[PDB]
Amino acid sequence: QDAPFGTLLGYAPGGVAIYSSDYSSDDAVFRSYIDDEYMGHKWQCVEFARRFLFLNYGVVFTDVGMAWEIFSLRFLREVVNDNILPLQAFPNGSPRAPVAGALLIWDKGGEFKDTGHVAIITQLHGNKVRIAEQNVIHSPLPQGQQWTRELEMVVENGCYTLKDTFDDTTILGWMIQTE
């Protein structure tokens, strides 16, 4: 059962909290911050992804309007000294395999209407990946579970293709910190 807005559902690797974002049933009270640093809107997908990178990597990606736009970003900002770090996009089906901590971007469409979606890949397995995200799962996570969903990964002819749990969505690809 889905929990009320803002309920702690569990944690992503590194002790990064995941909260329910069920608004159903402009104010600054819905703005998430971590020590003067803006994380995002409570408690959407972008907010979680930015907070995750901030708490576990000390970096953030710029404040985008829609999650699918993240796939067009090309740098990450190191919060401690504002140094800029290169970020590259890898289309779903790319020979460049996903890695833990990578950003996974969805284009707008289906379940993710006009916003698209963003999640953090937390684990790599031979035929699947575990991901952590906000605004998809609103119910408490099982004890010890530090991921929200697992996606099938098809490794064929040197390529990696991720399949979503939803049937009407479209995955753009994953982002990695590199030149």
CA distances in angstroms from 97 to 22, 81, 124, 156, listed in the order given: 33, 30, 9, 11
Q: Does 135 show up as a binding residue in the annotation?
A: yes
Q: Does 80 show up as a binding residue in the annotation?
A: no
Q: Which of 177, 57, 60, 173 is nearest to 119 (CA)?
A: 173
- What are the φ and ψ backbone dihedral angles of 70, each rounded to 5 degrees? -55, -35
Q: How was this structure determined?
A: X-ray
Q: Which of 140, 152, 160, 170 is nearest to 1 (CA)?
A: 140
Q: Does 145 show up as a binding residue in the annotation?
A: no
Question: Which amino acids are annotated catalytic?
Answer: 45
Q: Does 67 show up as a binding residue in the annotation?
A: yes
| Matching CATH number, 1-179, of 3.40.50.880, 3.10.20.340, 3.90.1720.10, 3.40.50.720 | 3.90.1720.10
Instruction: Determine whether 167 is exposed, middle or buried from the number of CB atoms within 10 Å of its CB (0-12, 13-18, 19+).
Output: exposed
- What are the φ and ψ backbone dihedral angles of 48, each rounded to 5 degrees? -65, -50
Q: Which of 70, 128, 74, 77 is nearest to 98 (CA)?
A: 128
Residues just before a chain gap in the chain (C–N exceeding 2.5 Å) are: 25
Q: Does 66 show up as a binding residue in the annotation?
A: yes
Q: Which of 89, 67, 82 is nearest to 133 (CA)?
A: 67
- Spatial CB neighbours of 119, under 8 Å, sequence gap ≥ 6: 45, 49, 103, 104, 106, 131, 132, 133, 136, 148, 149
Collapsed DSSP state (helix, strand, coil) of residue 134: coil
The reported resolution of this PDB entry, expressed in Å, is 2.2
Domains of the chain: which residue ranges? 1-179
β-strand partners of 16? 12
